[PDB]
């Protein structure tokens, strides 16, 4: 129908940016229209948002300046827009100290109508932003190296005691520490790395090996033991990590002797710096002044709390307490409850006024969901979710994904927020914020019918007459199954008095495609057909995937607006194969309503998965046809020639008068005495009445002159008194290839013909 498929503009393929969603934007103060696209983070492009313009019959893109810059993997980008500015939300990962779990929420930035920063928001530590009274307006870890002494001066009983001590210590530390690994070294005469950090990953093997080591005996070369621990462990070649803390536990008996290395220089050496030194004394023979001072040198600077004389089994309380971690409750395990850590605020967004925004919190409270009504200028928000009266209700509402999609509805003199919960029960639902007083909560108003159809994943209010009050609400079920994943869309009519929803129609895609995904993307495209009524577009990105060549696939369906509501069938179907080669998932994002070609006519953008397309909108022409007969009536038994004057006119103001019909040609034909078995009159020239081709001149009027002759043969007097019917049918012959100007198109909802009656003089007293 109205969209010019023959002249698309496409972002360069394979080059930057790799489009994910596209939307048209316009600054109300300057009337510039840009095309905002969002791309995932890549080495070429760091930015998540780009503004593109039409230059040299292509779409060139330049990144926007002050938007958040994602780091690492792609975790989500969301860009909505209204006449109050552009909102961009990025998902981020954060790790708190000594936390064995991560946080996943959004950092957002609000920009003005002209793409200048206005607000920044981080949604970590949500507790300090929340304001439960806010009025809702409705109009590496640690490594521990052990230095076991079995170097003579140690009886089998004391050695066995030491082995039990070390084994119990290892087990205890593995229980109270998660990311704490171990290494060991026996240094009796020789030095022998009994086990290494890589083996520490298998706890059972290391524990079994601890009991399986045998005394080596000989002489106590403790300083050499330290130097060996530093030349073999803590070194990244054997598995150590530079970031992790470093501890040591020295089970020496104090009888150092025959040490090839100097103790004092080894202990204080720069390499030793940065590693703790816990010293345990073995044997009763540690009561000499020299041995005591040796221990004191070995142990950390605050000798108390590090130096010891007996194997007390809780002497290592300090690390056992300092290194304690916290675990967020996960699948099948106990832990800290999931309240807001994985809230993913900003998953869906919506701009309400100059300050306030609406955000989706799909992951809040064990994936129950919700939404945050954030006030950007005051930096205070209010969380809104479904009420739970008992534990059963709370556990029943989990994993509903409320806040997956958010929208707003304009009633006569009020507002109403709604949300999508595609996983609700198991078929989906749409909620509405039923403010009752101080408390406002989401209560379900619409429910899907099929499991896994993801009802409520897409919302799309439509104000057909553009009066400021929503008249319909489109709700999509992209994965609906009949033979494959066809999709299905539901149109709901909002009562003008109660605000209730009543099903009106169920839109389905073109028959013959079992893998369409009809309804995955939906948008109100403003007014395209120049009729002052809003038109809508639905997207079916999987249409034609794999079948036949499969070079391109996807579809977009244009539905027009009527005073009654949406149409019954689509007025256009744009197939990706006819648009350009290589388009994949054509129709997973759409926008419109803003002029980007330079005429006064709103245009449209359809974003594939990696490219964006832009289509002009053609001018819709409405032809008024009149004719003057001569003589005004048919005299009884007339035999003269009838003179005919036929004049068309452009009753449509969609085009300047001094452009006529462009390169479109008017093709009209005449039918004489329609409906009569034998025609009373006839045309004087077959050429002048069949396939008559004319070129519209400058202006809004065209005219012609024709002649009619009496039909041959005996008079068919049977129905003389009835008015004679003359019919005119017309079309447009629009050129073939790409054109500089979008050629006009006849209106699809006005009959392309007219019938004029010529009375026949009566035989009564009064002829007419």
């Amino acid at each position, epitope marked *: 129908f109205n969209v010019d498929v023959a002249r698309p503009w496409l972002t360069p393929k394979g080059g930057a940016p790799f489009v994910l969603s596209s939307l048209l934007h316009q600054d109300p103060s300057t009337n510039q229209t840009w095309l905002l696209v969002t791309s995932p983070r890549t080495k070429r492009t760091p930015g998540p948002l780009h503004r593109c313009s*039409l230059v*040299q019959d292509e779409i060139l893109c330049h990144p926007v300046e002050h938007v958040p810059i994602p780091k690492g993997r792609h975790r989500g980008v969301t860009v909505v827009r209204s006449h109050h500015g552009v909102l961009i939300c990025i998902q981020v990962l954060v790790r708190r100290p000594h936390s064995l779990s991560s946080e996943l929420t959004g950092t957002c930035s609000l920009l003005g109508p002209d793409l200048r920063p206005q607000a920044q928001a981080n949604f970590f530590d949500l507790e300090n932003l929340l304001d439960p009274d806010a009025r809702v307006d409705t109009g590496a870890g640690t490594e521990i190296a052990i230095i076991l002494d079995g170097s003579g001066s140690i009886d089998p009983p004391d050695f066995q005691r030491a082995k039990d001590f070390i084994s119990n210590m290892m087990r205890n530390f593995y229980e109270k520490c998660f990311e704490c690994n171990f290494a060991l070294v026996q240094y009796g005469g020789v030095i022998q790395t009994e086990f290494d950090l890589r083996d520490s990953q298998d706890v059972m093997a290391s524990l079994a090996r601890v009991q399986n080591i045998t005394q080596v005996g000989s002489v106590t070369k403790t300083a050499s033991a330290m130097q060996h621990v530093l030349d073999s462990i803590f070194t990244s070649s054997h598995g150590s990590r530079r970031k992790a803390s470093k501890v040591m536990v020295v089970l020496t008996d104090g009888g150092i002797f025959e040490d090839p290395l100097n103790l004092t220089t080894v202990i204080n050496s720069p390499k030793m710096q940065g590693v703790e030194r816990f010293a345990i004394g073995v044997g009763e023979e540690f009561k000499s002044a020299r041995t005591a001072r040796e221990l004191n040198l070995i142990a950390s600077d605050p000798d108390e709390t590090h130096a010891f004389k007996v194997t007390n089994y809780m002497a290592l309380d300090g690390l056992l307490s300092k290194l304690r971690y916290n675990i967020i409750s996960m699948e099948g395990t106990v832990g800290d409850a999931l309240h807001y850590q994985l809230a993913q605020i900003g998953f869906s967004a919506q701009i309400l006024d100059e300050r306030q925004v609406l955000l989706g919190a799909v992951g809040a409270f064990d994936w129950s969901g919700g939404a945050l009504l954030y006030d950007t200028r005051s930096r205070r928000g209010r969380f809104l979710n479904q009420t739970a009266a008992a534990a059963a209700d709370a556990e029943a509402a989990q994993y509903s994904y409320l806040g997956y999609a958010v929208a707003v509805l304009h009633k006569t003199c009020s507002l109403s927020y709604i949300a999508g919960a595609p996983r609700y029960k198991h078929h989906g639902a749409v909620f509405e914020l039923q403010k009752e007083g101080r408390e406002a909560s989401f209560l379900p108003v619409l429910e899907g019918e099929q499991m896994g159809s993801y009802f409520g994943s897409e919302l799309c209010p439509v104000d057909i007459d553009m009066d400021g009050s929503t008249d319909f609400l489109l709700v999509a079920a992209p994965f609906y199954h009949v033979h494959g994943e066809e999709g299905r869309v539901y149109v709901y009519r909002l009562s003008e008095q109660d605000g209730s929803f009543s099903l009106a129609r169920i839109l389905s895609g073109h028959p013959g495609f079992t893998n369409a995904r009809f309804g995955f993307a939906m948008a109100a495209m403003g007014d395209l057909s120049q009729d002052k009524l809003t038109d809508v577009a639905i997207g079916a990105p999987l249409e034609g995937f794999g079948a036949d060549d499969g070079a391109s696939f996807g579809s977009v369906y244009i539905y027009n607006g009527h005073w009654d509501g949406l149409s019954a069938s689509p007025s256009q179907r744009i197939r990706a194969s006819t648009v350009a080669p290589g388009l994949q998932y054509f129709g997973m994002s759409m926008a419109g309503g803003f002029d980007i070609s330079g005429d006064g006519l709103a245009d449209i953008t359809v974003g594939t998965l990696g490219q964006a397309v832009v289509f002009r909108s053609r001018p819709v022409v409405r032809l008024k046809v009149s004719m003057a007969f001569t003589p005004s009536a048919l005299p009884i038994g007339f035999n003269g020639v009838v003179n005919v004057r036929l004049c068309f006119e452009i009753s449509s103001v969609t085009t300047a008068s001094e452009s006529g019909l462009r*390169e479109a040609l008017l093709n009209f034909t005449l039918d004489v005495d329609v409906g009569k078995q034998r025609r009373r009159l006839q045309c004087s020239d077959v050429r002048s009445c069949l396939g008559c081709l004319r070129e519209w*001149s*400058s202006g809004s009027q065209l005219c012609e002159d024709l002649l009619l002759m009496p039909t041959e043969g005996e008079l068919c007097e049977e129905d003389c008194f009835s008015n004679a019917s003359v019919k005119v049918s017309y079309q447009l012959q629009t050129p*073939e290839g790409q054109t*500089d100007h979008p050629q006009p198109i006849l209106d699809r909802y006005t009959e392309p013909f007219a019938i004029f009656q010529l009375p026949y003089e009566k035989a009564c007293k009064n002829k007419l």
Partner: antibody
Amino acid sequence: MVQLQRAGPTIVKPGSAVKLSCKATGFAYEDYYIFWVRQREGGNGQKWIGRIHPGSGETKYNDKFKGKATLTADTEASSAYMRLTSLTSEDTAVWYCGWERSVGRATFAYWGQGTSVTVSS
Amino acid sequence: AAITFNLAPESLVVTAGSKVTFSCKASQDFLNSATKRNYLTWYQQRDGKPPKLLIYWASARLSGVPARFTGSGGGGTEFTLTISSVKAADIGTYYCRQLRSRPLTFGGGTKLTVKQ
């Protein structure tokens, strides 16, 4: 009535750039295309240069003048400009702006008076 | 690349009150398959003046052009402009031009000269 005027002849040194002008009157400027064409002396004929739509500022260029020409439209003053970059002695010729026919197709329905460009040291 | 034009002859020796015939031919077809109009234009230039539009589509004259000019030129690949009776004002050069596809190209021109 539709008519176009230009700045007139110019003399520039080799390597400089000239910004010709084509003021338009008698019609809505943000509507109709402006086409440029150069008639090289010595009987070399004519060759179409480029195109620009004042409403959207979009352009399209013949490959031969892709980096040589650069068209722009000043909707406020209703004046169209072409910039010739890194001129040489060869570029000396007479250049014309144009106005497409409203109905049908005729790239140059109206022409400007003429403007001659001479590059010499 | 581009469509080539073979506008010939380079010049005609003519006398006032005689017929004329230019012959411009294109390397490709101009007949637009939808509007069925051949996309070719004719221009006229006199010495020291900018050219003028004579015939926009293959056979359609512009307002103000005297009737003695006829576009003829059917087929879509070969075209002929015929001047009925040459006159002193008609002395000049005529160029044919492609209109269907980019880049737009001209025919080189054909100049008239009075015989003597």
